[PDB]
Structure 1
């Protein structure tokens, strides 16, 4: 049960024509340590346009989920991004009004706006970068664990309160890396990922190496049950959460190009996905961090569907405790979730999570064929909320 719900029903009207992401790199010294935020979001926004041959002025709204950026810095980094991607003055750029969020509502509110007829083309996107461009348009560490410290004590509570332990939590982490490695090795991310040609300063000598990033650098294929249960608990004393069974903050961007179905047809644009429904729920405050498990059946029901109808699931793996609960509580087939790895392996790009997961889902749906008809993207909007989105495989 939910204290309240927001339900958006999109019908068959709202289609996705492009969904892309940068690779994700670990924020601490990872491969984006010398790339500024707009240099992450800009190629993703540019990729949507290029894939669709669209005049950037036709885009009605860009909404970006972003957590790390303090105060006004949020919008100015996104405006930079949109400017360098070739969007004019007139294309409005908005951030999501949340202290802490994974940015799935950015896609949902773009879709809602199209549904209500406010404009015909929109972009829902997300960005996180620990770096700061000295060149401003016209603290970040604090904001990060500000979202993660409350998130970590709740999922550890849910673990003690529901009986989730190191065991399943670690197993989930092993699986995540196994699946992320297998995906990477098999080239399954090639389609969704937009390579980022940046620079990397070498700590030993300080020279700038030209670099193209193509791979998520947080995947650790040598992870097993063995080495994980060697790191000490990260929060509590006898806490089951580790640096191994929780995701660390990653730099990256994602973006989703949404439009009304009739405008995609006349533009000769293949439909990647159909945005069916979105539910956002307020959960029981005495059991926080269980958001996804209330939001999933709420969104699936609004799609006029059953849990078993859903072929794929993208559920955020910020914490294995949290992730295992939701899977087990809903009795989901673990073969259908994060089939190509999750946050624990490829990184947790906070506000870029929502757009990241949409790209991963839809492209895997694209690859799996017509029988992979229904997908779910689910995550929190802070500890006290759950958000889930239902997507149908688009027809190409």
Structure 2
């Protein structure tokens, strides 16, 4: 149980008409190492618009999950992105008010504002990038560690206290890379991924070669239980968390275009998803990192559903310790979770995780057809909180 809970009930009124993401690239030496943050968010914001033939001035609100950027750089990067995607002055751009989070509430608060009648159309997005445009509108490594070190140490304790073994954690990372490799090789990410045309600087020569990034570069198809069992602990001398069974910061962006069911209908826009419910929960401080394990039952219950009704989960894999705990504690069927791989394989783009997982969930549900009716997206909001979202498959 939780200390408190925010619940948003959206009924049938709030649909998703588009949900997309950039590829995710490892922040340390990945294919976005010479790509600025606004050049990740802008093409995802722009695709929502192009895919729905929507006038950008019709969007009532853009809320962005963004963590790495310090202070005023958060908003300025998003406004840079918004401006360059063609949004006018009159479209307000906001950030998620958290020191550390994974961005899901951005999607939920946009949904809530639509349900409240504040506006008809909104974008819930997310963005992270280790790079800084020298051109600002009108540090970052510290910020990554500041969020992730506490998350890692707490989860290695929760795992240590509930007996989540090194094998169990490593098996999760193996499964993640297996599933991400298989989804990539089957072209299952093609619908959700907006390829990013950019440049890659050859460290040897300094030459900038044009590159179009289309694939998640963090995937390691050769990952085995054997390769991972060789890896050394990252936090404490006899700890079970390694570089292999935890996720690394990746550059990327995600965005979800939400609207009132009746406006999508007058516009002739297929429904990709129906946002049913959102719950954010404050957890017992005695056992932090376990966010999702508390928020999932909360959001499912608010949807008038039982855990067994959920066909697919997207549960963030920031650390296998915490991922395996939350899965095991809830008794979830492992075969319904991160079916196309998780952050251990494709990466952890902090504040973009929420929109990223929304895109993955909805497009897989689309793909799996009518019997894939209900989906949950879940993740932490920093060590003390969980967030979970219930989605119903759109009719298209």
Question: Where on the TM-score scale, by shorter chain, does this alignment land: which range?
Answer: over 0.9
Q: CA deviation at 1:182?
A: 0.1
Please give the secondary structure, in 1, of the residue aligned with 2:286. helix
Cα distance in 1 for partners of 2:160, 2:38 equals 41
Cα offsets for 1:159-182 (capped at 9, x unmatched): 111000110000000000000000
Report SS of the residue matched to 2:80: helix
What is the rounded CA distance, in whole Å, between the counterparts of 1:309 and 1:160 in structure 2?
31
Distance 2:13 2:138 in 1: 38
Quote the residue 2:303 is aligned against.
303
Q: Which runs of 5 or more structure 1 residues have no equivalent in the other structure?
A: none
Paired residues for 1:203-214 under 5 Å:
203-214=203-214
Is the partner of 1:277 in helix, strand or coil?
strand
Matches of 1:135 and 1:279 in 2, distance apart? 38
Matched residue SS, 1:138: coil
Deviation at 1:345, TM superposition (A): 0.2
Q: Tell me the SS of whatever aligns to 1:281.
A: strand
Distance 2:316 2:16 in 1: 21
Shift >2 Å, 4+ stretches: none
**Alpha-carbon distance between aligned partners in 2 of 1:214 and 1:391, rounded to the nearest angstrom:** 26
The aligned residue for residue 225 of structure 2 is: 225
CA deviation string 1:281-333 (max 9, x = no partner): 00000000000000000000000000000000000000000000000000000
Distance 1:338 1:252 in 2: 19
Q: How far is 1:373 from its partner?
A: 0.1
The alpha carbon displacement at 1:251 in A equals 0.1
Segments of structure 2 that go 5 or more residues without pairing to the other structure are none
Taking the aligned partners of 1:320 and 1:136, their CA distance within structure 2 comes to 37
- Inter-partner Cα distance in structure 1 for 2:136 and 2:298: 42
User: TM-score, normalised on structure 2?
Assistant: 1.00
**What do residues 18-74 of structure 1 show as CA deviations (whole Å, max 9, x unaligned)?**
000000000001100000000000000000000000000000000000000000000
- Indicate the SS of the match to 1:111: helix
Aligned to 1:238: 238
**Shift in Å, 1:276:** 0.2
The secondary structure found in structure 1 opposite 2:108 is: helix
Cα deviation 1:99-149 (Å, max 9, x = unaligned): 000000000000000000000000000000000000111100000010000
Whole-Å Cα distance in 2 between the matches of residues 67 and 136 of structure 1? 17
Q: CA deviation at 1:346?
A: 0.1
Establish whether residue 88 from structure 1 lines up as the match of residue 91 from structure 2.
no
Q: Distance in 2 between matches of 1:377 and 1:241?
A: 24
Per the alignment, residue 254 of structure 1 pairs with 254
1:146, 1:388 → 2: CA distance?
A: 23
Find the aligned partners of 2:165 and 2:91 in 1 and give their Cα distance: 48
For 2:248 and 2:88, the matched residues in 1 are separated by 35
Instruction: Please give the alpha-carbon distance, in whole angstroms, between the structure 2 residues aligned to 1:225 and 1:142.
Output: 31
CA deviation map 1:212-266 (0-9, x unaligned): 0000000000000001011110001110000000000000000000000000000
Q: Secondary structure at the match of 1:367?
A: helix
Matches within 5 A, 1:1-396: 1-396=1-396
Distance 2:231 2:203 in 1: 26
Q: Could you tell me how far apart the structure 1 residues matched to 2:159 and 2:263 are? A: 47
CA distance in 2, matches of 1:110, 1:199: 33
* CA-to-aligned-CA distance 1:147-205 (integer Å, 9 cap, x gap): 00000001000111100011000000000000000000000000000000000000010
Aligned alpha-carbon RMSD (Å) = 0.3
CA drift of 1:356 comes to 0.1
Aligned residues: 396
User: C-alpha distance in 2, partners of 1:369/1:240?
Assistant: 39
CA displacement, residues 64-103 of structure 1 (integer Å, 9 cap, x when unaligned): 0000000000000000000000000000000000000000
SS in 2 for 1:7: strand
